[PDB]
Every structure is written in C-alpha cells, then in structure tokens.
A paper describes a structure:
YggS is a PLP-binding protein found in bacteria and humans that mediates PLP homeostasis by delivering PLP to target enzymes or by performing a protective function. Here, we report a functional and structural analysis of YggS from Fusobacterium nucleatum (FnYggS). FnYggS consists of 8 β-strands and 10 α-helices and forms a TIM barrel fold typical of the type III fold of PLP-dependent enzymes. Although FnYggS exhibited low (<35%) amino acid sequence similarity with previously studied YggS proteins, its overall structure and PLP-binding site were highly conserved.
The crystal structure belonged to the monoclinic space group P21 with a = 37.929 Å, b = 146.375 Å, c = 74.128 Å, α = γ = 90° and β = 93.355°. The crystal structure of FnYggS-SeMet did not exhibit the electron density considered to represent the PLP molecule, consistent with our spectroscopy experiments showing the absence of PLP binding in FnYggS-SeMet. Instead, a sulfate ion was observed in the PLP-binding site of FnYggS. This sulfate ion was coordinated by the hydroxyl oxygen atom of Ser201 (2.7 Å), the nitrogen atom of Ser201 (3.0 Å), the nitrogen atom of Gly218 (2.8 Å), and the nitrogen atom of Thr219 (2.9 Å). This result indicates that the sulfate ion in FnYggS-SeMet is positioned to provide the binding moiety, as is the phosphate group in PLP. FnYggS contains seven methionine residues, among which Met200 is located at the PLP-binding site and is downstream of Ser201, which is involved in PLP binding.
Numbering used by the authors: 1 to 223
The structure:
Amino acid sequence: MSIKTNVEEILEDIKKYSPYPEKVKLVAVTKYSSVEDIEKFLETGQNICGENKVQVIKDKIEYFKEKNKKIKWHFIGNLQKNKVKYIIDDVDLIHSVNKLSLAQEINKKAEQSSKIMDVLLEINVYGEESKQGYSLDELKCDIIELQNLKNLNIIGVMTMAPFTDDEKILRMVFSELRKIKDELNKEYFNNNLTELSMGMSNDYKIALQEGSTFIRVGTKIFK
C-alpha cells in the first residue's frame, strides 16, 4: 500500500469525473488515523484533513502546531453547541451546521475571536429518522436569520447519503442536494454558495459526477 499513490489515484478520478475539476477539494478523513499517518498524507502535497470528534481534533491540532505543520482543518462530525469553543480558532470549515441554534453559537464564538467562520449547511436530503441535517422547509424558514449572522460565511451545503450500492439512489441523493444549492443560490444567496460536500470512499466517483466539490475520503486514502 502507498498513501501517495492512493491520493494520486483520487486526483485522477477528480479530473476524470468532475464537471469542474478545478473546483474540487479532497478532504482526507483522518478520524481513524494516527498523527504519523496524517503526516504521510501531508507529504503527498495535500493538507485538508477532516475530523468528526472534538476531543480528537483538539489534540491533533495542538500536535501539528507544535510540529509546525500547515493543515487546513475541517470539522465534519456532529458539533455540540457547548463544544464550539474548542475548535473555533483553528478549524477552517465546519461542514455540519444543521440547525439555527448551532449556527448562532458558532457566530457568537467567531465574533468573540474577531473572525468569520466558513460553514456549510448540513441537509438531510434522504430523510432518515437518524436525522440531524436540515429539512429543506426548516432551512427556508431559518434563512434570513442565518444570513444575518455576520461572523458566519455560509459557502455551501453538505449531505451524507446512506451506504448503498444502488447507483440510482446515490445519484438521486447527490443530484437533489445540487438542486437545493442551485435553488438557494437563486432565491437567497445571490450565487454565493460555491461548495457541495458529498461523497465518501465507496461512492465518491458518483459524487464527483453529480458535482461534488468536497469528497470526504478516508478508507481509500489510508487503507
């Protein structure tokens, strides 16, 4: 196995499958990786790392600070309101903004640090009852209050499809999120939504074809 060659294969897939390869970022899902393996990922020339537990990313952030390594940290898991304080100063993008109360806490902590936190709105497109993401109706109801949080920068949307081998279902899920982004860009965001965070190790080639700009790939990189 070779981390470099795994990364290189994914970048080829991006060129092959994306309707706009220049927009697509690889998010290495490092949630099960040691700092040694993460360092090997950085040595490929990539440096976007996504984590999903606050305590874990907290400790990895400090580690790579002390080793003076440059990383763009993404938070891609469930973010409890009272844990925002631990990542607000070092995470570059929060993918999982699923409700107004969380957006309001992120905004409040960002303003206290005199910064604007980039976020994605997490949307439950397939409608599971292990739901955390927005329904579209809930998001529409929240929109103006979200757009008035001046220390948030809402740059896109995110979904997680259920695991399946049915390509028709995956395309339905990924295309529906894209339709939502396009609609939100006409009605509310003046085309300022640029990002679509969708796709994981077992389906990212489909996600790329449906316009993903962040693929969250762990297994394919590290195993």
